[PDB]
Structures are given as C-alpha cells and as structure tokens.
Amino acid sequence: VTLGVYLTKKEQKKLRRQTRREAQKELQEKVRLISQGVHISVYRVRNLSNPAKKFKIEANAGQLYLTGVVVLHKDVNVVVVEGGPKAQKKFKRLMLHRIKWDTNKCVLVWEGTAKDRSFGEMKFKQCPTENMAREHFKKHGAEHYWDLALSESVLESTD
C-alpha cells in the first residue's frame, strides 16, 4: 500500500543544511536561555543420519522461526519446513549449497504456499516403515507431501 519516498542527494543536502541550521538555532536557544499465506517447502535427502548436519538443519529451522518436521526412513529423509518466504529461501540456500551431503544427495521435492502452518515446532521424527511416517504426516494433515516424496524416491530408485 505505502510507497517509499526517496530524494536525490542534492535535495537531501539541502535538508541537512536546514537540519543543522535548526539544530544550531535550538542549541543557541538552549545556551542563550506467516499470516495470509505461508511458504511450505519439502525436500528429499538420501541419508540424514549425520548428527552434525541434522543439528545444523535444526538450528537453521529454529533460528529462522520456521516450523515443520524431519522424518527419516530407509533411504528416504523428508524434511518439511514452513514459514515466511525469506526464511524458506534461506533454508533452501542452506540445504542446497551450504549443507554438503557428499551417493547421498538432497533435492527439493516441492515448494508451495499454504493458508496457515500445520506443525508447531520442528520435531525430528523417526520411523523404519513408511506407514508410520504416513500416519504421522496425516495426523498433522501433510500426508500428500510425504506420499509425493515417497513416489519421487520410488521413481528415482526405479529409473
């Protein structure tokens, strides 16, 4: 709604002169007297068993005030984050360029916009089977992203 009001250097300079003049006058007088849409990303990594990388991902999720989950399974790590656009962009730039995995590769499965946040805080869930992770994702209403990540992992393993 509001627009930024910028001026040229000369105009500013005139203001400075006036400002200093006013200041001098005063001095001389003192001496003389996440709502409306939240960005939700979901990335798929081959191996997330490293404690240092998981701690760095948890620190990047907690410092950016973004919620979500990090589910681990048999060669399928689904990291879902949700928050603002700048926090999601910083998390994607950290997980795509700063977080060095290497046969272990991390790629972003999906990145969209939702109405509100689903999870409360970043909880590192763990499940050896995919049915428990699917039930944990459906308990918070995010089973479609986990199913899409599992289908993308199956298509990457088959092809």
Place this chain on the structure above:
RNA sequence: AAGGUAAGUAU
C-alpha cells in the same frame, strides 16, 4: 562685478 557662504547643534 564675480568664479572665495564649512557644515552641525539648540537658543
């Protein structure tokens, strides 16, 4: 003839 009144200040 002249071209040679200092001005100022209140009485």
Place this chain on the structure above:
RNA sequence: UUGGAAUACAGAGAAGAUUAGCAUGGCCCCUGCGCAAGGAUGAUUCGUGAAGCGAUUUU
C-alpha cells in the same frame, strides 16, 4: 565629606572607525551514531534369571 559654581556650543568623520586571528556553518575524505536491507559461514549341594565364548559311533 558639607555646600555651590557647573549669542552660546562644538568644529572638517564621532551619524563610534580601521585592520587581524580562531571556532562553527557549508563543502568533502575517513570514521562513528541512528537505520533500510540483502549475501554467505559456523557450532558345600539343588533350582531360576542376566552376560560372554565356541578327537572313541556311520568300520
């Protein structure tokens, strides 16, 4: 400390001058304050339970 004295006046600038220094302002380098903002990095016996280990008879 008393009391009073206090044409004339003044007169070529006095209708108070001349010269000079420092700071500030302004300008601009650096730095600081306030502040918009993105970028990437890093963290003695029996019974039961538990644990360890691994050549007489198929002539």
